[PDB]
Amino acid sequence: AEYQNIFTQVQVRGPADLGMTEDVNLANRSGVGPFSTLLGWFGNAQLGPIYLGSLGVLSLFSGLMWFFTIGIWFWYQAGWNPAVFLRDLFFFSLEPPAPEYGLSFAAPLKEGGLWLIASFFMFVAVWSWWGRTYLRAQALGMGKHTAWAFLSAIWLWMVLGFIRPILMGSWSEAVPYGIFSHLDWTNNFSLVHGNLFYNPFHGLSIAFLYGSALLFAMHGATILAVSRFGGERELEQIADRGTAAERAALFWRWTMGFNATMEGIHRWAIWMAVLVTLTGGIGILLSGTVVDNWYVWGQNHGMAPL
Amino acid sequence: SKFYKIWMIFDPRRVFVAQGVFLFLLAVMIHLILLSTPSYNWLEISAAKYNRV
Amino acid sequence: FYKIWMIFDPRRVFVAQGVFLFLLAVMIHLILLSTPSYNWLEISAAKYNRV
């Protein structure tokens, strides 16, 4: 019966906001796109403008090549049949070369070479996007927290696709490009290394993924509960603490016995999120290269009855 | 009668769109059921009559 | 009895009642079709030897 502030009840539109021109080449920035009332019911209605620099276009074209390579392989697997393509869309897979090729690049296209091509494209796209996040932060004079938070996820991705295959000595260890295919790869990876549940770093990574869900629920709910005091304007609460920040702090102080500040809760948030992929990459790197049976390792380290 | 009062409460536009979706779903379902029964698949029946397959 | 339209909003009750009517009716029709004693098309096909 009361307004929960989940959806805006009255939308307001003014002149298009071009943004802050700190050091941004206004040539690279595109024009403001359309206004989406559907998106405006939940957040901002404005689309664009989007910046397109050197790294932006490099990453966009490299990612387009990766996506197109996978899609053309999928069309080949369908026998160029659109009905088959739609029927088996989730069952298609661009697989890495068989283990007998090792890390060599001399695998046939149908048996792993096209996977290497798509992998190179993806590698370029992701690293150019990382540089792009760093440079976009730099142009506006902001800190580089987004770049390092992205670097954590990039490290999990690199361990999965690049570093662990090299350590294990074959491209066959890497992840195929496919919807159900990479799910099968995940399940098989767990089975081969003996119940990845007993990997300590898989356990910590899950602790932090659960903790990210918990913490974003807590933080979103807290900010919505104090939005009646302008609590969603967190930067001004950092600069000039209002009653929203105090009420949020006191809620969690009286509930848990300790609280955060408007600025430090975001340190909690960023670390809780990055630890997911950081710990996960460590665990995946250890799997196979150091421990090949995590249940037996568990038994030898407590964690499981002998 | 006095049925036009039904337009004094419900938005005409969404009524018409919902009616169109409902009618299309029903017609498609009825035709598909007729196809499912081999004794009313007019393509199959015509193939049997004209010795097509 | 007449107060049901006061507590309950007409649109929700009308739409839900009609939706339930349609789904229950089509379920009854499906059940009748499924068993071989109320599938009228099969009865007609066997009757006219068009099967």
Partner: peptide
């Protein structure tokens, strides 16, 4: 949208 939320296409259009 929640007022017309009591399939989805009816509210969608």
């Amino acid at each position: 949208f929640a007022f017309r939320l009591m399939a989805a296409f009816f509210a969608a259009t």
